[PDB]
Amino acid sequence: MVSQETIKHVKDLIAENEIFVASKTYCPYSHAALNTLFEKLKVPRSKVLVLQLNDMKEGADIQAALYEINGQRTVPNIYINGKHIGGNDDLQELRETGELEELLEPIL
Ligand SMILES: N[C@@H](CCC(=O)N[C@@H](CS)C(=O)NCC(=O)O)C(=O)O
């Protein structure tokens, strides 16, 4: 299983960044989520930590830690202000119900 140190590291990165996005360079859904955040929602790049797990030594451990934490297995795995949003579909869902704006206010 994933070490407790890895779990702690991931929890820390999520808490230290207004928006946290576990991603993979070749993931169509990650491109979509980031496009929405940066271009459509105009979120400042400095407010988002984007980790391309497929390009990181600990990428695999981080993805397993995330499953341990929130039960999600896929990327993108998005958090906004420490609150787990989910994947791209989850992000788009919140926009359609008009609930994403209230979450981004403190960040924008
Ligand atoms: N419905 C999900 C789909 C995400 C998805 O399928 N991501 C792929 C990468 S393109 C994935 O995580 N596959 C399993 C893995 O990479 O471990 C979303 O909208 O985020």
From Swiss-Prot:
The modification S-glutathionyl cysteine is found at C27. Keywords: Cytoplasm, Disulfide bond, Electron transport, Glutathionylation, Isopeptide bond, Nucleus, Oxidoreductase, Redox-active center, Transferase, Transport, Ubl conjugation. Its EC number is 1.11.1.9, 2.5.1.18. Glutathione binds at K24, T25, Y26, C27, P28, Y29, Q63, V75, N88, D89. There is a cross-link at K11 (Glycyl lysine isopeptide (Lys-Gly) (interchain with G-Cter in ubiquitin)). GO terms for cellular component: cytoplasm; nucleus. PROSITE patterns: GLUTAREDOXIN_1 (PS00195), GLUTAREDOXIN_2 (PS51354). Changing D89S: Leads to increased oxidoreductase activity. It comes from the Eukaryota. Induction: In response to heat shock and osmotic stress. It is found in: Cytoplasm; Nucleus. Residues 7-108 form the Glutaredoxin domain. GO terms for molecular function: glutathione disulfide oxidoreductase activity; glutathione peroxidase activity; glutathione transferase activity. Its main location: cytoplasm. The keyword Nucleus applies. Disulfide bonds join C27-S30. GO terms for biological process: cellular response to oxidative stress. It catalyses: 2 glutathione + H2O2 = glutathione disulfide + 2 H2O; 1-chloro-2,4-dinitrobenzene + glutathione = 2,4-dinitrophenyl-S-glutathione + chloride + H(+); RX + glutathione = an S-substituted glutathione + a halide anion + H(+). Present with 3030 molecules/cell in log phase SD medium. Component of the glutathione system which performs several activities such as glutathione-dependent oxidoreductase, glutathione peroxidase and glutathione S-transferase (GST) activity. The disulfide bond functions as an electron carrier in the glutathione-dependent synthesis of deoxyribonucleotides by the enzyme ribonucleotide reductase. In addition, it is also involved in reducing cytosolic protein- and non-protein-disulfides in a coupled system with glutathione reductase. Belongs to the glutaredoxin family. This is Glutaredoxin-1. It comes from Saccharomyces cerevisiae (strain ATCC 204508 / S288c) (Baker's yeast). The lineage of its organism: Eukaryota, Fungi, Dikarya, Ascomycota, Saccharomycotina. The gene is GRX1.
